[PDB]
């Protein structure tokens, strides 16, 4: 498994504008278009991102291009972040994916706020970090996805994504 497969599973793929779990306009593989409630604004942001008049729909290749851009942006965001970088550099390959996943869903900002969990992960206190990560709105609002990511940080394996 790799980060692309992992996020593909957690975010799915939709080729028409849709509302994400928080009601925000999104498309493709979890690519957020805007937080505004206006559908026009979203169609606007869509065309600007794609570079053509899409009228709210894109192709699979367009979706995959956004996804490649988004994963690259997240990793780079992590590396530019002073709170994130040290944790990311301390982790093994599987676990790094769980961090990227969080960053892709909630942004650099959002993750850098899980201060206590981040320190636990840095110290490799897996079971403790998992408990701490669960005391969050994130786990309470999207528990199935949060459980998969948390199990990933806990075990360092892909078991939570296996058989999906
Ligand atoms: Cl809580
Ligand atoms: Cl969920």
Curated annotation (Swiss-Prot):
Catalysed conversion reaction: Hydrolysis of (1->4)-beta-linkages between N-acetylmuramic acid and N-acetyl-D-glucosamine residues in a peptidoglycan and between N-acetyl-D-glucosamine residues in chitodextrins
Gene Ontology process terms (BP): cell wall macromolecule catabolic process; defense response to bacterium; peptidoglycan catabolic process; viral release from host cell by cytolysis
Top EC class, one word: hydrolase
Effect seen on changing residue 20 to E/Q: Loss of 99% of enzymatic activity
Protein induction: Expressed late in the viral replication.
The keyword Hydrolase is assigned to this record: yes
Gene Ontology MF, one: lysozyme activity
Source superkingdom: Viruses
Family: Belongs to the glycosyl hydrolase 24 family.
Described purpose of this protein according to its UniProt entry: Endolysin with lysozyme activity that degrades host peptidoglycans and participates with the holin and spanin proteins in the sequential events which lead to the programmed host cell lysis releasing the mature viral particles. Once the holin has permeabilized the host cell membrane, the endolysin can reach the periplasm and break down the peptidoglycan layer.
HAMAP family (alphabetical): ENDOLYSIN_T4
Protein name, entry field: Endolysin
Originating organism: Enterobacteria phage T4
Gene: E
């Amino acid at each position: 498994m790799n980060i692309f497969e992992m996020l593909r599973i957690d975010e799915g793929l939709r080729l028409k504008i849709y509302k994400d779990t928080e009601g925000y306009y999104t498309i493709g593989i979890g690519h957020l278009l805007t937080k505004s409630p206006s559908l026009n604004a979203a169609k606007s942001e869509l065309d600007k991102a794609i570079g053509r008049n899409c009228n709210g729909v894109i192709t699979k290749d367009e979706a995959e291009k956004l996804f490649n851009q988004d994963v690259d942006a997240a990793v780079r965001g992590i590396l530019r972040n002073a709170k994130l970088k040290p944790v990311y550099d301390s982790l093994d390959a599987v676990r790094k994916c769980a961090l990227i996943n969080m960053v892709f869903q909630m942004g650099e900002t959002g993750v850098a706020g899980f201060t206590n969990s981040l320190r636990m992960l840095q110290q490799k206190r897996w079971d403790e970090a998992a408990v701490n990560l669960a005391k969050s709105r994130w786990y309470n609002q999207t528990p199935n996805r949060a459980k998969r990511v948390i199990t990933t940080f806990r075990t360092g394996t892909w078991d939570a994504y296996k058989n999906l």
